[PDB]
Amino acid sequence: TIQLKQVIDLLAEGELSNIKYVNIDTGALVLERVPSLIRAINLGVLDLHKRFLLKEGMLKIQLEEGRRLYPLRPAYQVGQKPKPGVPQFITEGNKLGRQSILKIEKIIGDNGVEYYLNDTWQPLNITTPEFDVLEISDEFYCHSSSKTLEVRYRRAPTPMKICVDNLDSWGCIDIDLPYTHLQALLYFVASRCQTPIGFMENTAQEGFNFSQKYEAECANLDAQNLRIDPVGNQDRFTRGGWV
Amino acid sequence: AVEPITIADLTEVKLDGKGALDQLLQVTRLHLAKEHDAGRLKGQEYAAVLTGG
């Protein structure tokens, strides 16, 4: 799911050719605003991961009786930096970053049971008070019979860190996307960069046009169904009674 | 010391002549040609500007 940054910039030359970002007026060659370009591309990738799933992750929490709030932050995760004031209870899963948890979706115990999320008055309900924290009531401990939990959630990749010495290559960086959403990301970046430039009648609408094309492309991807889509088929026949 | 300025002096009919009109048109053509060689002009504004000028 990777692409060399080199190819991305070479293609974005073909749509940013009008403006400062990539061209000297004479002998059009890429400038050194590459930091700003990268900062825009990362935002584009995050937006695409918002619009389509494209990824999902997993953790594993080791419970502790009498605890009320379990935050999912990269200071409690094994292999991360062990801040002394916190006990590292997240013992397994994808490495956690600043933007990794877009939404928690499933919670599965060690017994194979499936608990309920934000479904009030359900038998064993788990509440998220702050979108990245699990609030576990005492009734859960009363009737839990489970020593660990498995969490699944919608992910977004962690962008690679650029560096002033890394300005040498900038071509070994790898964006994390399938190529389809590359074609879409081009329009996104072009719109964002071209918006605040131009004073002529036809040159003041390029940003708007690129936004329109971006939306059309997203709709086309949805229609072609090039993203993950689970579809549920319960049993309903093993409960005992529907047969 | 009287050199008579003539129509030939203004412009001979050839495209590549040495008349003043001819050389002004040639320099305009060169500037437009470089502009088109860079990604800035289509092949139709090239004609429009010249005909207007």
Three-state secondary structure along A102-145? CEEEEEEECCCCECEECCCCCCCEEECCCCCEEECCHHHHHCCC
Task: Give the β-pairing of A148-154 and A57-58.
Answer: antiparallel
Q: What residue has token string 């962008």? A: A159
Please name the residue of chain B whose CA is at the shortest distance from the CA of residue A26.
B38
Is B38 in contact with A25 (Cβ distance < 8 A)? yes
Is B39 in contact with A17 (Cβ distance < 8 A)? yes
Amino acid in the structure at residue B38: A
Q: What are A154's strand-pairing partners?
A: A103
Q: Decide: A125 and A119 in contact? Cβ < 8 Å.
A: yes
| Radius of gyration of the CA atoms of chain B, in A | 15
Least Cα distance to A4 among A159, A156, A176 occurs for A176
- Cβ-proximal residues to A94 (8 Å cutoff; 6+ apart), any chain: A57, A58, A59, A100, A155
Distance CA A134, CA A164 (A): 39
Angle A215-A220-A224 from CA coordinates, rounded to 5°? 150
Is B39 in contact with A28 (Cβ distance < 8 A)? yes
Q: Decide: A4 and A171 in contact? Cβ < 8 Å.
A: yes
User: What was the elucidation method?
Assistant: cryo-EM
Task: Give the β-pairing of A61-62 and A148-154.
Answer: antiparallel
Question: Positive or negative, the Cα torsion across B11, B13, B17, B21?
Answer: positive
Enumerate the H helices of chain A as residue ranges: 5-13, 34-51, 138-142, 179-194, 206-224
A97: left (phi over 0), alpha (psi -120 to 50) or beta: beta
Kindly state the tokens that stand for A83: 């801040």
Q: Decide: A47 and A161 in contact? Cβ < 8 Å.
A: no
Q: What residue has token string 């397994």? A: A92
Least Cα distance to A30 among A52, A48, A6 occurs for A6
Kindly state the tokens that stand for B9: 């002096």
Within 10 Å of residue A7's Cβ, how many Cβ atoms?
13
Element housing A3 (H / E) = strand A2-4
Q: How far is CA A137 from CA A65, A68, A147, A148, A204, in A?
A: 11, 7, 15, 15, 56
Q: Decide: A100 and A84 in contact? Cβ < 8 Å.
A: no
List of chain B residues whose C-beta atoms are within 8 Å of the C-beta of residue A17: 39
Distance from CA of B24 to the nearest CA of A (A): 24
A5-13 and A179-194 are packed helices; what angle lies between their axes, rounded to 10 degrees?
50
Q: Decide: A125 and A107 in contact? Cβ < 8 Å.
A: no
Resolution (A): 3.1
Name the 3-class secondary structure at A201.
Answer: coil
Distance CA B10, CA A197 (A): 45
